Symmetry: C2
Amino acid sequence: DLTFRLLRESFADAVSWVAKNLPARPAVPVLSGVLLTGSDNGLTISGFDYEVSAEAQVGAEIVSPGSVLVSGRLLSDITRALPNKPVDVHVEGNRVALTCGNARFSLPTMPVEDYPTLPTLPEETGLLPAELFAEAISQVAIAAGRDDTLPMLTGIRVEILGETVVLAATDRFRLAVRELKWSASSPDIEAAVLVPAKTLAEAAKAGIGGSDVRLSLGTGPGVGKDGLLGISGNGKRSTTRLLDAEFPKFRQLLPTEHTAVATMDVAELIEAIKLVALVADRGAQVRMEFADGSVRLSAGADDVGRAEEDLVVDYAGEPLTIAFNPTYLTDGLSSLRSERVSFGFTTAGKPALLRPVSGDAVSTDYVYLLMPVRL
Amino acid sequence: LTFRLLRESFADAVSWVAKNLPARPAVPVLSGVLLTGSDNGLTISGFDYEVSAEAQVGAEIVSPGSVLVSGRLLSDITRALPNKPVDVHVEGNRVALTCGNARFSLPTMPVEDYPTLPTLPEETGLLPAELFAEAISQVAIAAGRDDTLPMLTGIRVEILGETVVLAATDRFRLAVRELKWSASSPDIEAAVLVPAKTLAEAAKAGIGGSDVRLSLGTGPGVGKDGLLGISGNGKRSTTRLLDAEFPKFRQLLPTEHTAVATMDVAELIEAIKLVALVADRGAQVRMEFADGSVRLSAGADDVGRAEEDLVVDYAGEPLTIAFNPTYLTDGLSSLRSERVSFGFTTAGKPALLRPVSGDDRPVAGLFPAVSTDYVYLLMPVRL
């Protein structure tokens, strides 16, 4: 009942996006599948699990309408490996015929009724330039520390205030808040919700074309407990369930006046961190020793090596000697899309403030809170 | 010991010696790189169970003497330093290292407790670094993978006059390479087995257009040193030889064919990766040679089925033959030729692949096959 024809690249691009974030999974077989729907004008490619859904619609010559359920990872891997010709697709009983140039395929099909029905639209709360979203999330997500660790509730907080968006991501060592200006598709609206880095970042990492990223949480009176978040892009559209966990109240953590402040060249600092960090322990510390006109960046191993570098800086205040985890600090410096950096600390046991200095519930546009280490 | 020299000259010569070194093996002293200064200048020296590396470079030797610092640590520092001259002097039990605004204080290990690097055998002959690098990458694939089967883990290296012949094999593929050589040596007839892991790596570290000296010896006592020297401009390494018997491989290769074929290489690699996406477990890919057209095909109990028809030249009775996807593909990459030649006998016996667009005559003196400088022999599969 289903027959379509489109360009290989378009079909490859559409599937990969629906079959990356959420699939790549064998948990329940009846759900490794991706749904192909042959609407009168285009092909829609659908997919989800129990929480995060994804949908892609692309141009097609659908000769016969209908739908079909085929292996997720497989189709992706196939469409990318196929020739740069058009591809023809026919469903024959419960097998799918797929021809692209001189290559034939036959894939086992799954029953179209077993597949869950996707989530809908939480009404458009507003939109913003995809480049901005790409940056915002890209910055903040550096701080929701999650690598080889168990995924403790790992989320980027998203707050809407009239037309002011605030993105906050933290673990417990670092806190990254970013502010954002918004074409808010509703009157002044207030919304503070939590949605896990995992997916959110990817929708943004898509690195969408233009000013078309479209945040769907509803225009209502706060989006309800229907834990949904829609991202809509140029044809690409994905929902994701939002966590029930509560974010810290970050405004608290941020100081107004800080006992001491200085500024230095980002590039140069990142090169010297990695320089002296080479000798840093498994208890990774790096010692910054602030004085007028200069900082003595040093680190050491309690056994095997010692390192130090004098760097120029514009310091001002009562000298501070303080240490950081070289990786969380360098994450910060990188996070700042700035040539130079503002440092705002209070005590060698109180958070230090990383702000971008591109000279010539938040404070400036990008703010980055870093916990110190002791001795 | 005190000396000065440029960051890059130091970095390059330390990371060359320290790459083969282990971060923390059984004996601590083996993790370290030996730094010696004399009339010649600074010398980077590293030893191992099986490889010894040594690099000589110019430095201003302010004070002769040797020292023992962590091999991998010194490599990491000298790479990260700002591009300014580096200063080193040994303070009692520690090394001070000064480059611009950065200063380092590394700890030493006891220097008397470092062995003397095994001595280089006489030069057996020499060949451009480039060929050496290609010939190994070519043959190294076929090397029997990490197993309790040593005979297969080696790369065989045999010298016949002005000809060198390189071989490797797991019991499923066999790769032979033939080179033109400059043996500064007379009769020169020898055969040796060296570990593929180490050889490949030592030949990966060979580029730029220069030459490379192979040192096993020259007399009847050739390769009998238990070592292989490979050296050039200041850089000198030896690798332990492998005491195992290599297979009598020349016998293994067919001399004539029931069926030959040729086809486009990049075209064939690409189509292989396509159909095998659907193959059982990367287990097999079925080729169906007819005249003019070969049907590449793959399947899986119930995962999917695939088919490509590729433009082949053929001569002989339409053979149908299964190969392993990966082994097949390695073989193809292993020829750096634009096209490929196929030699077959039965669906259950070896296929012989060689580069096509290559008019080198491996010259004589003392339906068919043919002469090539490189062959890759693949066993087939079924079910």
